[PDB]
Ligand binder design. Structure first.
Ligand SMILES: C[C@]12CC[C@H](c3ccc(O)cc3C(F)(F)F)C[C@H]1CC[C@@H]2O
Ligand SMILES: C[C@]12CC[C@H](c3ccc(O)cc3C(F)(F)F)C[C@H]1CC[C@@H]2O
Lengths: 10, 241, 242, 10
């Protein structure tokens, strides 16, 4: 999905 | 969950925010070639992209932010990202009258903003904001409070009890600002006067953001410069036309 | 001048007396809406409200002290914000509804009648719910609206025009003292006073955001000639240059 | 010359 969504949990 | 954020003193709020501060990044500026509209747009968007990665991790260190589910976290950042880039730019441009310090190796005046179509109008607004902060003698402790306010407030009206949590934290930051002004020796009247002055500037920052968002969108829709996938998605979150 | 010599009560008094009337819409017998029908009523209303806004602005303390040029710029920058905060204020006790006029009360589903307006309606309604939950007072409302008039355009003003910006900021501090005075009189503690002040001013950030969106929407409706816009309205729109 | 000019002067 969204890159921002992924980055917020890495 | 009573929250550690609300259980922070004003001094604890300041320390956490100061520590969470992102570093100043460098531009990919190559002084061997002249500026074009495309190369300058490429330079600034490349910088913004790398700043965004640090912003995301900065947000997670802003007290109360990670208490939100992922969906509002995404929402707040999508709404405030350009505002945050702008208040940061304006802050580090303070001691450079007539110039914008995008990076230590990228210091631009309004005439260099003319290289990109319609961008000089944006530069002027940013420069004026920087002059305002310089005139007010904006302090670093005040700056980090304002930037955190922008993050929590800009997208909160576009959303229960989740919004109440955000407002509790915002009130804590308000308490922190007053605490700072009081420690600086400002009278009780000067405190609420300055508080108002700083917060009213956020209205102009919002305005600059909406104008900058439209400009970035028009640059993208004319294939002037390729934006990163992250940047495309942050831009897409505002629909625009 | 004289606006600087006003006390907190005289500020409230001056602002309350300067309040424009609540205009009616020319709405109905012809029954329901089309996209052009509703846009016509809304733009016709806004145009007539603009005439009263200008006379209201001149009754705002310190405004007539400014040059004609500065007065034009401030109104050009803030006119839609002023319309929005007014709409939001009088829609406060009508949850889920926008009271454009006493005879024109619309819900968000009626915002769907016009392309891309329901998004703007949603932002206005949420702002109204915010004011309602804050229990926004009329005395607080008139202070906020005056602040919008003086603040929204002040950032986009080298000469001795530094005297103009300084005057605008002196009056702004005066309205801040007034807002605090109202809260202190309301029995709020010092901590509560500063918190509520911050809460009210941060809403102005959202109001700015709504105006920018509204200006774009009104511009898109203007270009396709769905609705006829008055010369005055077209000029106010032209001042924002897209 | 603007309409807003005229209205501010009445
Ligand atoms: C390329 C633009 C100008 C630079 C801007 C930017 C970049 C990086 C910053 O650290 C700060 C800014 C900011 F100016 F926003 F403060 C991003 C877009 C917005 C409008 C233009 O398209
Ligand atoms: C026709 C529009 C919707 C009504 C709007 C309006 C009119 C009159 C008011 O008293 C308040 C508003 C306001 F909604 F702004 F609050 C004007 C334009 C702005 C965006 C649309 O094109």
């Amino acid at each position: 999905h969204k890159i921002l969504h992924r980055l917020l949990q890495d | 969950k009573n929250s550690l954020a609300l259980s922070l003193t004003a001094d604890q709020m300041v320390s956490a925010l100061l520590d969470a501060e992102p570093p100043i990044l460098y531009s990919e500026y190559d002084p061997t070639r002249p500026f074009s509209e495309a190369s300058m747009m490429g330079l600034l968007t490349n910088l913004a992209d790398r700043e965004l990665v640090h912003m995301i991790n900065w947000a997670k260190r802003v007290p109360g932010f990670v208490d939100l589910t992922l969906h509002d976290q995404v929402h707040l950042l999508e709404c405030a990202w350009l505002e945050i880039l702008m208040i940061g730019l304006v802050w580090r441009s303070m001691e450079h009258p007539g110039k914008l310090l995008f990076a230590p190796n990228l210091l631009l005046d309004r005439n260099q903003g003319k290289c990109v179509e319609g961008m000089v109008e944006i530069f002027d607004m940013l420069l004026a904001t920087s002059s305002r902060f310089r005139m007010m003698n904006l302090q670093g402790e005040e700056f980090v409070c304002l930037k955190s306010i922008i993050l929590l407030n800009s997208g909160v009206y576009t959303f229960l009890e989740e919004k109440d949590h955000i407002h509790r934290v915002l009130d804590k930051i308000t308490d922190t600002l007053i605490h700072l002004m009081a420690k600086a020796g400002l009278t009780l009247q000067q405190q609420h006067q300055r508080l108002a002055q700083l917060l009213l500037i956020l209205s102009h920052i919002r305005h600059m953001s909406n104008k900058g968002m439209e400009h970035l969108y028009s640059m993208k829709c004319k294939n002037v410069v390729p934006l990163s996938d992250l940047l495309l998605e942050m831009l897409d979150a505002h629909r625009l036309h």
